Structures are given as structure tokens and as C-alpha cells.
Design brief:
It is built from 15 helices and twelve strands. The protein is α/β, with parallel strands linked by helices. The strands form two sheets. It has a ten-stranded mixed β-sheet with strand order 1-5-12-11-6-10-7-4-3-2, sandwiched between helices. Strands 8-9 form a two-stranded antiparallel sheet. Bound molecules: the ligand Cn1c(=O)c2[nH]c(NCCN3CCOCC3)nc2n(C)c1=O and cacodylate ion. Cacodylate ion is lined by residues 102, 182-183, 185-186. It is classed as hydrolase/hydrolase inhibitor. Keywords: hydrolase, hydrolase inhibitor complex, methyl xanthine, HYDROLASE-HYDROLASE inhibitor complex.
């Protein structure tokens, strides 16, 4: 069988399962950068306020167009540099370095030069410098007319949301492409050291065969949004929780499971809560060298990338929830085989805030130096609480919550055990009263194992707490005093034996 458990058709999805949204309104905990009274389906949102307002401080994005970006005006310099005809890739490198002189011997542009000169055919290169790049320059230089409202940083411990237009995101991402954000470049920076990279200079470095695919994916997006402005909104929400379950005493039952070795989160999990297997610095290596699950999603839905402008590194009790990002590309492969396929026309419905009905949550797993480290109770509890924070929606009934669409979170380079991570996510989803849709990407044995364990536990009516206690027992009996790198007995066999005895 290609899938097991509850039919995916029985799982809750947005918009069908959602509640009526409240009136979109700015407040203490919600920054709204557009005119809500003029928000209309199929119309480009109007920025609020009408005239540019600047904040240059430690609580807000430092905009490139600020009069405090300096002594001469760096914004004036950016304008002069970028309003030149590009005909060769050195012209673009020289332009970017005119307002980044301090990095002229540090930043490598080999991948940009190679993409333009050695990957693209002549007509594609001509279209890039005659049309796409000039259009990207123009939307970048329009920033003060587009992003008129200061953008607060989503700093650690803040529970805060920013809702902005897709067009505003496009102007900001064009600026990131041209590397115009100040104070975001130094290796030894104090300010913004706890924030991800935003400027795209590392995308231009080196000779990985992955860079042309990343650049094809991003220019697909840039060509689309400069040619016809997207009309919707996107919300970025930082969520930080204090009260976490007493997992050992949780009497809640497990919820439903659909598990499959075919399909993908972003396509087969339409309208569900889609997990991004995140780096604590959200987006990971998207505009440097990474190309696994998080980077792929950030490339095919590039509006995610702007979370790096304002999202501080995630602490253990935090996540980032992004609602409304649009898919602009299709792809094949994964990591070293990733290829851009074609432009994608997103068919998702929009909600009453004109957001695409696509909800993604960034939750970062731990990176384990040793395999057995992840069975330590403090580490299991950490992963449980991280997933719980990513799945919990405090003031929402469970009937209005979509299923969670996820997979082997943290089980690649970070050393996670897929069977443990599956069960941790199942327990966190149960505590948050959400069903689980789990994708194993070709691993049919894993699909069967997760299904079998789930049905075993549910048929025996074991609670979240019952299961967590078994995890603690597995640590104590097979991990704590294990002198070898791997345990004598595996987790799921241990669980079966413990319960059946
Ligand atoms: C979103 N997404 C995919 O699209 C995807 N494609 C492939 N195929 C081959 C690569 N290996 C397959 C088995 O797992 C390890 C990776 N793996 C994928 N994974 C893990 C994923 O998360
Ligand atoms: C743009 As700078 C000189 O603050 O790294």
C-alpha cells in the first residue's frame, strides 16, 4: 500500500476548517503595513502610511533608504550604482560593490558570473540584463514608496505578528538580492549577530552545481512579481510559549495518523499546517550553500526568505508561523539532485485577509553529536516542547485546526532518529489536539513501522503520558548506561515488549 491509516480525505484542511477571521487591524502585537479599509480581492494593496516614515533603532529593520544610512547618503549611492546599463556580469558585481566597498576582497561572485556567462544561453542572458535585472532594480529603488511603515524586529521572547503585502516583500527581496541592507554583513557584528543573513551575496559565491538551480528558482520569482504585482498579504508570527505540558501526566489520547511514502508536504499537504524542518536561524542556507527541505521551500516560496530580515534566532520555546506565502516554482530532486523545473501558478484560495491558504511553521530540531544523546529526557522534552509550540494555536478549537503535514524532522545532517522523531511529533500533535499527516519520501518500511506503532498504541488506549513514560524507560534501560554508540534494543521493539508484558 502507498499509504496507511486514516484516509487523507478525512483530515482537516484550510480554508474549509477555519473560523471566520477577525477584522484585520494593527494593535500592540500586530503590525499591519497596508490600508485595511482599501484591501480588496485582486487589487494591489495600498501602503500605510502614505508617506515614508523611518525608524533607525535597535527594535526595527534598518532600511537602506533611511536618511541615517550613511558622510554621504548610502541610499543616494545605491541609486547611482544600480541605475546603470548592465550588459556583462562584471557590471552587476561592480555596481553591488560600489556601496559595499569594505567587502570587495571578501565577497566572491563566481556563481553569478558563471550563471550569466556559462549556464544561460545568449537569449536568456539578454533577457536577464535587458528586462529582469532592470525591473528588479526599479522595484528595489521604489522601496520608500512601498515599505512606508517601519518594520519591527521579531526579537526573542516577542509574541508579535507582521502582516505585509506580497508586493512589499518583493521590493525588500530585490534589495536583498542587490545586497543593500546595512549593518547585516560583518562577520564580527554585534548588532544582528543573532539574526540570519539577509543580503544575497553568498548566493553568488563558488561553483556548486546547485547555485544555477537556486538562481533559476529565484529569477523565476523575480520575473513573475516585477511583471505583475501580486495582490495578497503574508503574515509572519513569532510565537513563544511559557506553559508547557507536564508530559508524564498528560491524559490526552493520541490523534489520527495518515502516513505515506509518496507525495510531498507542499503539494499533498495543501491547507494543512506544513512543517519547515528549520535551522534556528530561519531559512538555513537558502542564500548560501544549503539545499535540503527548508531551503527548497524558501526557494519555491521566496516570500519566506524575508523572514530572515526581521526574525531573531529561535530559542528553545519559540517558533515562526508564516501564513500566505505563494508557490512560484516547481522542482525535481532534492539536495545534490535539486533542479528548477518550471514556473508554478499557485491555485490556493485566499482567506479574508487576502492571504493564500498556506500555513508553514519553522521549528528547529536539535543537532546531535552522538546518536544516543537524543534519548536523554531533557532532549526528548525539548523536542516535544518545540513541536508543541509549533502546533499549538492558543485560542482555537481543535475542530478548527488543520492536520499537521510533516516528516522526518531533524533526521538528516542533524542526526535525529526517524522513529523517535515521528513519535515525538505524534505526541506533540496529540497534546495540541491536531491530527498528523506524515511523509516518508520513499521509505515504505518506515511508513509501515510508524503506522504499526500508532495503531498499537491507540488500540491499547495509551495516553500521551503513557507513551512519554515509555520513552523515559527506554532511555533508562537501554541508553543511560550504554557504552556503545548504538543501543542493544531499538525503540519500537522495546515499546512493544514493554506494553505487551
Ligand atoms: C521534502 N522532501 C523531498 O521532497 C524529498 N525527496 C527525496 N528523495 C531522495 C533523497 N533521500 C530520500 C530518503 O530520505 C532522505 C533523502 N527525499 C526527500 N525528503 C527527505 C524530503 O523531506
Ligand atoms: C552595510 As555595513 C558597512 O553596516 O556592513
Amino acid at each position: 500500500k502507498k499509504w496507511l491509516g486514516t484516509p487523507i480525505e478525512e483530515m482537516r484542511r484550510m480554508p474549509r476548517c477555519g473560523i471566520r477571521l477577525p477584522l484585520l487591524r494593527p494593535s500592540a502585537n500586530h503590525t499591519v503595513t497596508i490600508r485595511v479599509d482599501l484591501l480588496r480581492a485582486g487589487e494591489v494593496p495600498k501602503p500605510f502610511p502614505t508617506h515614508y516614515k523611518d525608524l533607525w533603532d535597535n527594535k526595527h529593520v534598518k532600511m537602506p533608504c533611511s536618511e541615517q544610512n550613511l558622510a554621504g547618503s548610502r541610499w543616494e549611492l545605491i541609486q547611482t550604482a544600480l541605475l546603470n546599463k548592465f550588459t556583462r556580469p562584471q557590471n552587476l558585481k561592480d555596481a553591488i560593490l560600489k556601496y559595499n566597498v569594505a567587502y570587495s576582497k571578501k565577497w566572491d561572485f563566481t556563481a553569478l558570473i558563471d550563471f550569466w556567462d556559462k549556464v544561460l544561453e545568449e537569449a536568456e542572458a539578454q533577457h536577464l540584463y535587458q528586462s529582469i535585472l532592470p525591473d528588479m532594480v526599479k522595484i528595489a529603488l521604489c522601496l520608500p514608496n512601498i515599505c512606508t511603515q517601519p518594520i519591527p524586529l521579531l526579537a526573542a521572547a516577542m509574541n508579535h505578528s507582521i502582516t505585509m503585502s506580497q508586493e512589499q516583500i518583493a521590493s525588500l527581496l530585490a534589495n536583498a538580492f542587490f545586497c543593500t541592507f546595512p549593518r547585516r554583513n560583518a562577520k564580527m557584528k554585534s548588532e544582528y549577530s543573532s539574526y540570519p543573513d539577509i543580503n544575497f551575496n553568498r548566493l553568488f559565491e563558488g561553483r556548486s552545481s546547485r547555485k544555477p538551480e537556486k538562481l533559476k528558482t529565484l529569477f523565476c520569482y523575480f520575473r513573475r512579481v516585477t511583471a505583475a504585482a501580486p495582490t495578497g498579504l503574508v503574515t509572519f508570527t513569532r510565537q513563544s510559549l511559557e506553559d508547557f505540558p507536564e508530559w508524564e501526566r498528560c491524559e490526552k489520547p493520541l490523534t489520527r495518523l495518515h502516513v505515506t511514502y509518496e507525495g510531498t508536504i507542499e503539494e499533498n499537504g495543501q491547507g494543512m499546517l506544513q512543517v519547515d524542518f528549520a535551522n534556528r536561524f530561519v531559512g538555513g542556507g537558502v542564500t548560501s550553500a544549503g539545499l535540503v527541505q527548508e531551503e527548497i521551500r524558501f526557494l519555491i516560496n521566496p516570500e519566506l526568505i524575508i523572514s530572515r530580515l526581521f526574525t531573531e534566532v529561535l530559542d528553545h520555546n519559540e517558533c515562526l508561523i508564516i501564513t500566505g506565502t505563494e508557490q512560484y516554482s516547481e522542482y525535481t530532486g532534492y539536495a545534490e539532485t535539486y533542479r528548477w523545473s518550471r514556473s508554478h501558478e499557485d491555485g490556493s484560495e485566499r482567506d479574508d485577509w487576502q492571504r493564500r491558504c498556506t500555513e508553514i511553521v519553522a521549528i528547529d530540531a536539535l543537532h546531535f553529536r552522538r546518536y544516543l544523546d537524543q534519548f536523554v529526557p531533557e532532549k526528548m522534552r525539548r523536542e516535544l516542547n518545540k513541536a508543541y509550540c509549533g502546533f499549538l494555536r492558543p485560542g482555537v478549537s481543535s475542530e478548527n485546526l488543520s492536520a499537521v503535514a510533516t516528516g522526518n524532522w531533524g533526521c538528516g545532517a542533524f542526526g535525529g532518529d526517524a522513529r523517535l522523531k515521528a513519535l515525538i511529533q505524534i505526541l506533540a500533535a496529540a497534546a495540541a489536539e491536531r491530527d498528523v499527516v506524515y511523509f516518508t519520501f520513499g521509505d515504505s518500511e518506515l511508513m509501515r513501522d510508524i503506522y504499526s506503532m500508532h495503531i498499537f498504541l491507540t488500540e491499547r488506549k495509551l495516553t500521551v503520558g503513557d507513551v512519554y513514560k515509555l520513552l523515559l524507560r527506554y532511555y533508562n534501560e537501554e541508553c543511560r548506561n550504554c557504552s556503545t554508540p548504538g543501543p542493544d534494543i531499538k525503540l519500537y521493539p522495546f515499546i512493544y515488549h514493554a506494553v505487551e508484558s
